Design a protein around this ligand. Structure first.
Ligand SMILES: CC[N+](CC)(CC)Cc1ccccc1
Ligand SMILES: [Mg+2]
Ligand SMILES: [Mg+2]
Ligand SMILES: [Mg+2]
Length: 340
């Protein structure tokens, strides 16, 4: 089963898994999309793609999403992983010029993806493809919000570059602000809306209960990744991890830091369960008997429901994905699925 140091019985008992019915087609289609966009080598796609469970992760998250919405999300999510991989490889191989150029290309492509569908850099071209498809579901105000959020995410990745180049391990709270961006908290929160087929008015999505529930879902996911990816990231000289920040700055041992991380991870679960009642109560309040009210009520309920799904999907993803199976690699510093 799941290692005791990563065991979360509450998740296993109170957060039952869910799987989108489109998943089987999703797994094959994203794999095809990875190949035809040349984002991974053909033989690495063959050997590793399905084992990475990227599609599985998303299909256990955005339940109720239209098939084409889930597809665009999965393709984007898969791109996000290979972006993390080249971000890592640029740092290790010390390719600062290449990173800065990619950084500039991503910013530009984010606002104008159509112009970049056939850019020479395949990573850019793949990004433009998934982003443009994501822009075809909801009004431009949502597209603008997604872009504004991802612009921040890119710069967050640039901060990580400069931290790792200089060996700077961020302070605990410095990291926590940073982790909200490098994990793309608000992208995932944004994508809840096209999954339920409705852009929420600011007044609804900025409701304190919605805000708190959305945050707690992402804080759990990010910090659990830190807990589970810690072995691979130490071996890979990654410095961005709550466990690492606690060791470096609070003189915690490895054993102590792991215990501290899971406690914070567990606080997320119980805090979420509290505010989930508030968020769900808010959903009931939106249903005032009007058509518009019924729409907003249903959207919020689905979204909060998927905030909950994020817990279970992320939890099992870290135990099923080959991305974190560092023990099974010849070279622990270089993941076999990574373009080296
Ligand atoms: C690894 C990068 N990722 C996924 C693409 C987005 C920043 C975080 C993540 C890791 C593991 C599970 C869910 C999200
Ligand atoms: Mg990483
Ligand atoms: Mg990273
Ligand atoms: Mg990680």
């Amino acid at each position: 089963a799941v290692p005791p140091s990563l065991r979360l019985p509450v998740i296993e008992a109170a957060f039952p898994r869910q799987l989108h019915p489109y998943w089987p087609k999703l797994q094959e289609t994203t794999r095809t999309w990875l190949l035809e966009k040349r984002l991974m080598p053909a033989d690495k796609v063959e050997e590793y793609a399905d084992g990475l469970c990227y599609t599985d992760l998303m299909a256990g998250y955005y339940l109720g999403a239209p098939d084409e919405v889930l597809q665009a999300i999965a393709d984007y999510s898969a791109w996000m992983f290979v972006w993390d991989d080249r971000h890592d490889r640029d740092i290790v191989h010390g390719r600062a010029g290449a990173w800065r150029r990619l950084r500039g290309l991503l910013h530009t492509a984010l606002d104008s993806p159509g112009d970049h569908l056939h850019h020479e850099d395949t990573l850019v071209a793949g990004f433009a493809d998934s982003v443009r498809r994501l822009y075809a579901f909801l009004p431009a105000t949502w597209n603008a919000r997604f872009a504004r959020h991802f612009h921040t995410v890119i710069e967050a990745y640039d901060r990580e570059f400069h931290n790792r180049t200089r060996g700077i391990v961020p302070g605990v709270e410095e990291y926590l602000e940073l982790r909200r961006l490098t994990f793309a908290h608000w992208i995932w929160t944004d994508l809840l809306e096209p999954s339920s087929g409705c852009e929420l008015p600011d007044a609804v999505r900025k409701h304190p209960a919605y805000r708190r529930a959305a945050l707690l879902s992402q804080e759990f996911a990010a910090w659990y990744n830190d807990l589970c990816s810690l072995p691979k990231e130490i071996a890979g000289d990654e410095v961005h991890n709550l466990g690492i920040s606690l060791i470096t700055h609070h003189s915690l041992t490895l054993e102590e830091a792991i215990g501290e991380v899971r406690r914070r991870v567990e606080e997320c679960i119980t805090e979420f369960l509290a505010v989930e009642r508030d968020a769900l109560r808010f959903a009931d309040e939106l249903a005032d008997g009007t058509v518009r009210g019924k729409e907003l009520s249903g959207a919020v309920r689905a979204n909060v429901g998927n905030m909950r799904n994020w817990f279970s999907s992320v939890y099992w993803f870290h135990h099923e994905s080959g991305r974190y199976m560092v023990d099974s690699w010849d070279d622990r510093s270089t993941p076999p699925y990574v373009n080296n």
